[PDB]
Amino acid sequence: QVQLEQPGAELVKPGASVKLSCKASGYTFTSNWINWVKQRPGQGLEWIGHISPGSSSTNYNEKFKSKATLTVDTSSSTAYMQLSSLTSDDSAVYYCGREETVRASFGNWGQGTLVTVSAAKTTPPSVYPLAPSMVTLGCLVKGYFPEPVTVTWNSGSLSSGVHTFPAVLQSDLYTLSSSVTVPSSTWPSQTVTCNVAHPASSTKVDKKIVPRD
């Protein structure tokens, strides 16, 4: 299984640089070109460029010539994109993708790295349970920075019945929540746990929903 692994998030000060990583596995790294793309949130894709890990040779979209540098480390199977002196215009998701030879530029995509460019510090979320023939439970994920957070229920095994709501910015912090609906014979007798990942601070929080007393 072809995998392109990108970190979830990077917080960057204005004027600083980042180096984004794209670790490949599931095929020989040197066999396929790597492409990179920029997507401002809610906005449509742009092509930054591509690199041959075999030969290290590159082609850039002119628009990015002086913002982006592509390299690879063959020994670790990892492709890098270095972005220089960041500006709020650079805040965006960045995807790496694997080219299928003479077929398509993005046969496989990484999950993308959300780069927030800001002077603000990282703040982890507070995670609060929402308890009351179907029952609805939830998680309130409050007061974090930057985006994103990831929410699952029972470690992904509760997939259907789930709504995770886009975050809303307020007072310079994000708040999100998630609901899950389960048969009333599942809860409270089985445990229902929300799993919150906030990659920019490498926090994971499991919150069990217990009945109020």
Binding site: S105, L130, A131
Partner: protein, 218 residues
């Protein structure tokens, strides 16, 4: 540079209908090897994009057959021959024949489906949040259609609009419905002076709102 133009930018379709999306390239897109590298990608809400069609008309591994691409020269087209809820998202054409490689601006496929009233749920602030000094009251209005809806909060019966934050999901992949959460954020002092809290949902499905409420005491 190859400018790729997609129309429409938004495509509303009923479930089971046919959908057609077109892409126009500002010049020809034949690669020196003879191949026309026209690709179609689909990006579902929250996810990275995924390859649908490559080389104008070939289905990528494990893409269903209700997807097919066609065209030539500068006019390319994507047909979805019987649309379902999992097909929601933004569709992009892309040319990989000439540097710099370029994407179309995207076409957003929307599902239109029968109306549906929201299932509304209200949640008291958690005991953990109270001990911390804050108090949020949360209301889910789940699985309703169409996207338009109003929520109204009431404290002891008096309407309250300060400190309310609302969020809508994107259309749901199983259901084609929308949901929204509404959060009333207060201080533990403010929360604790008042007794009943109400969430009211008004939606095209009824003249009378769905009302869900609770009392601070028990």
């Amino acid at each position: 540079e190859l400018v790729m133009t997609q129309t429409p930018p938004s495509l509303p379709v009923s479930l089971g209908d046919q959908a057609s999306i077109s892409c126009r390239s500002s010049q020809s897109i034949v690669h020196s090897n003879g191949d026309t590298y026209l690709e179609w990608y689909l990006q579902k809400p929250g996810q990275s994009p995924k390859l649908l069609i490559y080389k104008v008309s070939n289905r990528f591994s494990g893409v269903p057959d209700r997807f097919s691409g066609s065209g030539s020269g500068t006019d390319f087209t994507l047909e979805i021959s019987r649309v379902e809820a999992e097909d929601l998202g933004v569709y992009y054409c892309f040319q990989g024949s000439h540097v710099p490689r370029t994407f179309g601006g995207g076409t957003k496929l929307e599902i239109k489906r029968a109306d549906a009233a929201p299932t509304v749920s209200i949640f008291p602030p958690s005991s953990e949040q109270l001990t911390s000094g804050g108090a949020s009251v949360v209301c889910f209005l789940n699985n309703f259609y169409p996207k338009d809806i109003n929520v109204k909060w009431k404290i002891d019966g008096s309407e309250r609009q300060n400190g309310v934050l609302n969020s809508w999901t994107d259309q749901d992949s199983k259901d084609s419905t929308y949901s929204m959460s509404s959060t009333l954020t207060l201080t533990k002092d403010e929360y604790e002076r008042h007794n009943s809290y109400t969430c009211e949902a008004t939606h095209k499905t009824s003249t009378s709102p769905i009302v869900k409420s609770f009392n601070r005491n028990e």
